Design a protein around this nucleic acid. Structure first.
Lengths: 46, 77, 149, 271
RNA sequence: AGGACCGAACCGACUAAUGUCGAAAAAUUAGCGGAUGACUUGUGGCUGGGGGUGAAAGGCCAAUCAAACCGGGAGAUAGCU
RNA sequence: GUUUAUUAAAAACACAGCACUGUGCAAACACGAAAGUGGACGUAUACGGUGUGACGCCUGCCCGGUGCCGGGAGGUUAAU
RNA sequence: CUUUAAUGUUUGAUGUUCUAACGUUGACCCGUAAUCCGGGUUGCGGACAGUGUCUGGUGGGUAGUUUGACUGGGGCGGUC
C-alpha cells in the first residue's frame, strides 16, 4: 500500500523551502506570519 | 495600464442597473488610443496613449506645453 | 477649428483666413506638413505682424524654384533598357526607384515622392506618359519609352 | 503504392499502407534539422487549449524553405525524404553554389530533376515564379499571401490551386475548398501539384495507429454528465437537445467567420 | 512482421474462503487477466477549487470531493432538539 | 484496450472506419480584463466540433413546431 | 395655395478615387553575439477594420432565487 507521503529532500526544499517562500509576496506573508507567532522553524530547513 | 498620459483618466468601477434595479459591478474604461504627435521643437514624432478628451486638450493647448507638463510629472513619454 | 493657412489649399486656401476645418484634417495633415498653424487669440496678432507679408515672398520663391527645376530637362524624355521577356511579360515591374535614380544621375535632380505614376507601374513595354507634379499648381508631362534588351 | 496487408491477426485486417520505394532509406540532412518539443495541447498558462493532443512518436523539425528566395541559381534534386511534420514528402535540393535546402516535393519530381526560381524560370513543375508571370489557368501550389511571406496555400499532399482570372495588380485563385480568393500578383507560387496524392488512401487500421500519431481518444458529449457537457445526462441515451460545442456554441451548421477585414479579398464562399 | 499465441519478472484485480474491537483505515491464501505494447517504471517538471484533469465513473485532485484543505467574515442563521 | 483507488470490469467508455458541420491562415476554437500562448513553426489529402462505431446488405416518408442557412415586398421597432 | 424650373444655402444616404490618422503575426536596416520590443525606409490595406461611451436583439454559457396551505401519512383529486 503506497502511502501519500513519499519523502524527497529536493522536492521538499524546492516546494516549501525558504527561497521558495521569498519568491512570491504570498510566501513572504507566510514567513511574516510565522515570525509574528514566534515559531522556531520558519520553514522546512534541510 | 489603461491610463491616459495627458489627463490621467483611468478606469473607474461602477454599477449597471436593470429595470428591476438589480446592481452588478461594472467598469468604465477611458476612450484611449495610440496616436503619434509631430513636435516641431524636437522635429520628430512622439507616440502617446491618450484619450479622446486628452487629444482635444492637446489641440486646445500646445503639444509643447503638454509635453512640458508630462516631463514635470516625472514619467517618461 | 479656426486655423490660419500658409500654403495654397486648393479648396479653401486664402493666406491666413479664419476658416473652420475638421480637427483631424488640421491635426494630421496641415500642422505636421507646415501648411497651417493653430491660432487661438494669441497668434492672430503675430500672424498679421510678421507672417502677413514677410513670408509671402518666401513661399512664392519656392514655387518659382519648383517651376525652374521642372524645366531643367527640356528633352522631357526617359529611356531605360530592360531585359524584357519573350513577346511581352517584362522581367519585373518597376516603380519610381530606378526611373528616379536614372533621372537624378543624368537629368533633373528631384526627390522620390515627386514622381507619380498614373498608368500603373509600367507593365507593358512601349511608350508611356508620366505626370510629374513639382507643385500643387504645377504639373509636368514626361514621355518614357522602355526598350527591350 | 497502396498495399493491403493480410489479416494475420486483428488490427491488421483493415490496415492499408502507403509505401514509397523512392523515399530515402537513411538519416536526414543534419544541418537543416531542429528539435520539436511536443506540447500536449497546453499553452503558456499550462491549461489544455486544444483537446485530443498528446503522446506520439518523437519527431524532429526539418527547416523547409517556403520563401524560395534563391533567384537565378539552378538547383538539382538530390533525393526525396519522409517528413514526419507534413503529409507531403520533402525534397533535398542542392544548388549550383553548394547550398542544400528542403522544399515541398510536387507530383513530378524525381532524383536528379532540375528546378529554378525567380521570374526568369521555366514552366516545368517545381519552379517558383511571381503569379504575374504564371499563365492563367495553370495549377500552382505553395502560394504566398503577401510578397515575401513564404507560402501558405496548397501545402498538403495532393493539393493545388487554379488561377482563374487576373485583373489589374490582383489575381483570383480557386482553392481546394471551392473558395475564390483575390491575391496580389507580386506573390510567388510553385508550379505543379503537391506530391504524395495517395496519402489520403491510408486507414491506419487499429486504435494504436492513431495513438502514436499524436491523437488522443475523443469522448462523446452524450457519454458525459450534465456538469461536464451541454449534452449528457438522463437514463438510456437521451439527447433532446440541439447539437452544440462543449462551450455552448451551436455547431452543425452555424457560421463562425467574423473577420470583416479580409472580406474584401473573398469573391465567393464555400458551397 | 504482429495493439499475434503460451508463460515468469513486472502491471492489474474476475471468483472463493479467511479476516471485520483484523497482521492490514481493502490485506492474506488458492486460482485468475495482460505480459513488444493504446505497455510498464525511476527522476524532474506543468495544469489550483466553480478551477484542474478525466478512453467519462460525477471518477480523481495528500486515507477527506455533486465543488479539496487552512485562516478569516463568525458567537453566520436555526419558528428545531 | 480503458473505467467507479476502498462493494459495480460490464452490454458501459474508447476504438479504426463512416457521415454532417465549421474553419482561407492575424483560421475556426480554447486559456487569458489585456499582452500573449496553444491550434501550428501546421494551413483544406489540414485543423476543430458533433453523432455513429470494424466488415457485408443497406439506411425509407415527413420542413408543420424548434434550431441552422438565404431573402427581401410590407409592417413593428432603441439610442440619437 | 394646387401646378413647375435656372444660380446660391442646410444638407443626409449611396458610389469612385486619394493619403496624412489608424492597422500590418510583409520585406529590409539600426539599437544587438536578440524568432521580444522600439526607431527608420518601403510595400500592402486605409478612413475600413479595431477600441471606448450609449443603445436594440440573442444569451441556462454563468449567477441569485422562487416553485402555497388544508389533507384521516404524503402525492393525485378537490377546496380556499
Amino acid at each position: 500500500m503506497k502511502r501519500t507521503f513519499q519523502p524527497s529532500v529536493l522536492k521538499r526544499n524546492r516546494s516549501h523551502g525558504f527561497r521558495a517562500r521569498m519568491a512570491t509576496k504570498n510566501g513572504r506573508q507566510v514567513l511574516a506570519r510565522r515570525r509574528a507567532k514566534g515559531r522556531a522553524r520558519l520553514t522546512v530547513s534541510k | 495600464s489603461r491610463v491616459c498620459q495627458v489627463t490621467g483618466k483611468r478606469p473607474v468601477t461602477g454599477n449597471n442597473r436593470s429595470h428591476a434595479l438589480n446592481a452588478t459591478k461594472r467598469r468604465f474604461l477611458p476612450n484611449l488610443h495610440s496616436h503619434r504627435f509631430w513636435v516641431e521643437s524636437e522635429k520628430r514624432f512622439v507616440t502617446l496613449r491618450v484619450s479622446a478628451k486628452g487629444m482635444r486638450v492637446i489641440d486646445k493647448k500646445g503639444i509643447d506645453t503638454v509635453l512640458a507638463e508630462l516631463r514635470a510629472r516625472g514619467e517618461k513619454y | 477649428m479656426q486655423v490660419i493657412l500658409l500654403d495654397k489649399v486648393a479648396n479653401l486656401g486664402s493666406l491666413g483666413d479664419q476658416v473652420n476645418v475638421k480637427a483631424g484634417y488640421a491635426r494630421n495633415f496641415l500642422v505636421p506638413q507646415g501648411k497651417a498653424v493653430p491660432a487661438t487669440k494669441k497668434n492672430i496678432e503675430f500672424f498679421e505682424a510678421r507672417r502677413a507679408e514677410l513670408e509671402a515672398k518666401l513661399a512664392e520663391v519656392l514655387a518659382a524654384a519648383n517651376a525652374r527645376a521642372e524645366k531643367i530637362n527640356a528633352l522631357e524624355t526617359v529611356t531605360i533598357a530592360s531585359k524584357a521577356g519573350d513577346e511581352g511579360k517584362l522581367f519585373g515591374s518597376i516603380g519610381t526607384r530606378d526611373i528616379a535614380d536614372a533621372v537624378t544621375a543624368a537629368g533633373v535632380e528631384v526627390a522620390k515622392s515627386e514622381v507619380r505614376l498614373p498608368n500603373g507601374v509600367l507593365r507593358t513595354t512601349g511608350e508611356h506618359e508620366v505626370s510629374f507634379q513639382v507643385h500643387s499648381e504645377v504639373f509636368a508631362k514626361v514621355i518614357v519609352n522602355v526598350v527591350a534588351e | 503504392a497502396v498495399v493491403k496487408c493480410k489479416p494475420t491477426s486483428p488490427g491488421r485486417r483493415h490496415v492499408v499502407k502507403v509505401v514509397n520505394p523512392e523515399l530515402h532509406k537513411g538519416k536526414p540532412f543534419a544541418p537543416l534539422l531542429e528539435k520539436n518539443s511536443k506540447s500536449g495541447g497546453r499553452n503558456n498558462n499550462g491549461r489544455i487549449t486544444t483537446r485530443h493532443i498528446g503522446g506520439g512518436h518523437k519527431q524532429a523539425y526539418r527547416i523547409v524553405d517556403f520563401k524560395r528566395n534563391k533567384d537565378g541559381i539552378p538547383a538539382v534534386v538530390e533525393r526525396l525524404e519522409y517528413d514526419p511534420n507534413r503529409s507531403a514528402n520533402i525534397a533535398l535540393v542542392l544548388y549550383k553554389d553548394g547550398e542544400r535546402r528542403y522544399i515541398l516535393a510536387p507530383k513530378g519530381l524525381k532524383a536528379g530533376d532540375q528546378i529554378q526560381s525567380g521570374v526568369d524560370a521555366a514552366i516545368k513543375p517545381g519552379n517558383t515564379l511571381p503569379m504575374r508571370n504564371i499563365p492563367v489557368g495553370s495549377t500552382v501550389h505553395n502560394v504566398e499571401m503577401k510578397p515575401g511571406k513564404g507560402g501558405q496555400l496548397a501545402r498538403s499532399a495532393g493539393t493545388y490551386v487554379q488561377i482563374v482570372a487576373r485583373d489589374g495588380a490582383y489575381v483570383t485563385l480557386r482553392l481546394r475548398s471551392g473558395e475564390m480568393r483575390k491575391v496580389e500578383a507580386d506573390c510567388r507560387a510553385t508550379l505543379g501539384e503537391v506530391g504524395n496524392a495517395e496519402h489520403m488512401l491510408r486507414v491506419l487500421g487499429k486504435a494504436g495507429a492513431a495513438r502514436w500519431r499524436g491523437v488522443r481518444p475523443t469522448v462523446r458529449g452524450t457519454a458525459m454528465n450534465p456538469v461536464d457537457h451541454p449534452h449528457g445526462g438522463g437514463e438510456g441515451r437521451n439527447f433532446g437537445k440541439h447539437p452544440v460545442t462543449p462551450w455552448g456554441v451551436q455547431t452543425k451548421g452555424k457560421k463562425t467567420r467574423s473577420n470583416k477585414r479580409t472580406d474584401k479579398f473573398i469573391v465567393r464562399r464555400r458551397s
